[PDB]
Write an enzyme that holds these catalytic residues in place. Structure first.
Site, PDB file in Angstrom:
ATOM      1  N   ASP A  44       0.817  -1.202   0.000  1.00  0.00           N
ATOM      2  CA  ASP A  44       0.000   0.000   0.000  1.00  0.00           C
ATOM      3  C   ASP A  44       0.860   1.264   0.000  1.00  0.00           C
ATOM      4  OD1 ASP A  44      -2.652   1.382   0.737  1.00  0.00           O
ATOM      5  OD2 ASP A  44      -1.319   1.989   2.386  1.00  0.00           O
TER       6      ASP A  44
ATOM      7  N   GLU B 293       1.110  -0.416  -5.175  1.00  0.00           N
ATOM      8  CA  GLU B 293       0.132   0.596  -5.554  1.00  0.00           C
ATOM      9  C   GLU B 293       0.849   1.943  -5.511  1.00  0.00           C
ATOM     10  OE1 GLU B 293      -1.972   2.329  -2.564  1.00  0.00           O
ATOM     11  OE2 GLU B 293      -3.280   3.465  -3.933  1.00  0.00           O
TER      12      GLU B 293
END
Ligand SMILES: OC[C@H]1O[C@H](O[C@H]2[C@H](O)[C@@H](O)[C@@H](O[C@H]3[C@H](O)[C@@H](O)[C@@H](O)O[C@@H]3CO)O[C@@H]2CO)[C@H](O)[C@@H](O)[C@@H]1O
Ligand SMILES: [Ca+2]
Ligand SMILES: [Ca+2]
Length: 415
Positions: free
Chosen positions: A190, A216
């Site tokens: 993340d 991401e």
């Protein structure tokens, strides 16, 4: 299931994965303390639908709360204890075992950039003044400082110094724990703008070198300084550079940007359409996730950059027939009725042998998007929102219809 890194050492686990995002934003509110139980019960169905992997929610407990309202979803965890809002530690182990037993690799969402520093009762208590936190050092804006070699989450008061040997090692050991005790086959990193990409390579090398990874990176050219080459680069170039340094696949936000802002014909400018296989094979494609898309429940979820319903079938047809590694969003598959269509396209992908590095050619004389994809077993002709009449207009060989949906706005033919 092929294992193996790419020719450049990128951890795309054979290039043959088909991933389910195994949650939506409001799960902790719509199925309180019961999601792991649900995934355990659904494991055999997920496998039968053709998925090779499932992206699990952040397993670290999150009891945060804010006011729109939210909290608890895992992105503001306070320690690594697994007894959180998705279910208990025991239920997580049972769900991961059921999914693995059904042939579905378990990928955990992990959030190294920050933690709920202010939560009153937690197992990880890092004091100030020892270099553990971004704001132990001067913090003049959203850019690296002497205690944080990436960007910060909002105000930065909860950003960790992931490069501190103690903090680096904490996450290294917890990745190893997820692999040894919770069945992890890989990780989704993340907010990777928040820390160095090389640290993802190090963490994976240390604790899960042969596993699947994906990061991401959601950061457009406009967010970089004037003197940074990324300020005038394409979205493709920015995410590819991250992948190079992390040796990890990367979510194809170049494709997502074209789906949101461009025409259907423009979808060819995602990373997964790049003619260099070293470029397209590291793309992890998606239609929406828990952040960009809607979710059932309060406020319709986050819907920060959602694809309109008139393009959902087209977008899944594209990502499931094309190179890169595709991800299917829980709610499209299992809440909103696209499952039978997606099931069909997954079978088409597998029957054709499309993999992350399959070749894709785009054809010019028609409306919409017309592509030919060279799978290991079959060639596909894909026509989206197109006036193409038949595959023989754009490809040699004998073809049969595989998909025809949405009044011909989605058509796929196969060799
Ligand atoms: O007052 C500063 C203090 O509050 C803020 O952090 C909160 C955010 O305002 C809030 O939106 C929420 O952030 C979540 C995102 O909305 C969501 O998209 C996803 O990424 O998970 C996030 C974490 O749950 O929660 C945070 C923290 O509670 C402010 O940003 C910081 O300066 C500080 O946390
Ligand atoms: Ca594989
Ligand atoms: Ca950071």
């Amino acid at each position: 299931d092929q294992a193996g890194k790419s020719p450049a050492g990128v951890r795309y686990h054979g290039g043959d994965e088909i991933i389910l995002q195994g949650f939506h934003w409001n799960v902790v509110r719509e199925a309180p303390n019961d999601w792991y139980n649900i995934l355990r019960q659904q494991a055999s169905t997920i496998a039968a639908d053709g998925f090779s992997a499932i992206w699990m929610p952040v397993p670290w407990r999150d009891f945060s709360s804010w006011t729109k309202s939210g909290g608890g979803e895992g992105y503001f965890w306070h320690d690594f204890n697994k007894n959180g809002r998705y279910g208990s530690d025991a239920q997580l182990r049972q769900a991961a075992g059921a999914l693995g037993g059904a042939g579905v690799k378990v990928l955990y969402d992990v959030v190294p950039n920050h933690m709920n520093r202010g939560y009153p009762d937690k197992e990880i208590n890092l004091p100030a003044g020892q270099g553990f936190w971004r704001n132990d050092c001067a913090d003049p804006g959203n850019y690296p400082n002497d205690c944080d070699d990436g960007d910060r989450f909002i105000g930065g008061e909860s950003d960790l110094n992931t490069g501190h040997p103690q903090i680096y090692g904490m996450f290294r050991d917890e990745l190893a724990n997820l692999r040894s005790g919770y069945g992890a086959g890989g990780f989704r990193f993340d907010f990777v703008r928040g820390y160095a990409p090389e640290r993802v390579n190090s963490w994976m090398t240390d604790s899960a070198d042969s596993s699947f990874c994906v990061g991401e990176l959601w950061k457009g050219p406009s967010e970089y300084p004037s003197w940074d080459w990324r300020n005038t680069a394409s979205w493709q170039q920015i995410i590819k550079d991250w992948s190079d340094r992390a040796k990890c696949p990367v979510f194809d936000f170049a494709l997502k940007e074209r789906m949101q802002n461009g025409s259907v014909a423009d979808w060819k400018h995602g990373l997964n359409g790049n003619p260099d296989p070293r470029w397209r094979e590291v793309a992890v494609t998606f239609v929406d996730n828990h952040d960009t898309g809607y979710s059932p429940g309060q406020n319709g979820g986050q819907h920060h950059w959602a694809l309109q319903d008139g393009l959902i079938r087209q977008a899944y047809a594209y990502i499931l027939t094309s190179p890169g590694t595709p991800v299917v969003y829980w709610s499209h598959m299992y809440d909103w009725g696209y499952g039978d269509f997606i099931r069909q396209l997954i079978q088409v992908r597998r029957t054709a042998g499309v993999r992350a590095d399959s070749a894709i050619s785009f054809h010019s004389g028609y409306s919409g998007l017309v592509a030919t994809v060279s799978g290991s077993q079959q060639t596909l002709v894909v026509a989206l929102n197109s006036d193409l009449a038949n595959p023989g207009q754009v490809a040699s060989g004998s073809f049969s219809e595989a998909v025809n949906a949405s009044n011909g706005q989605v058509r796929v033919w196969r060799s």
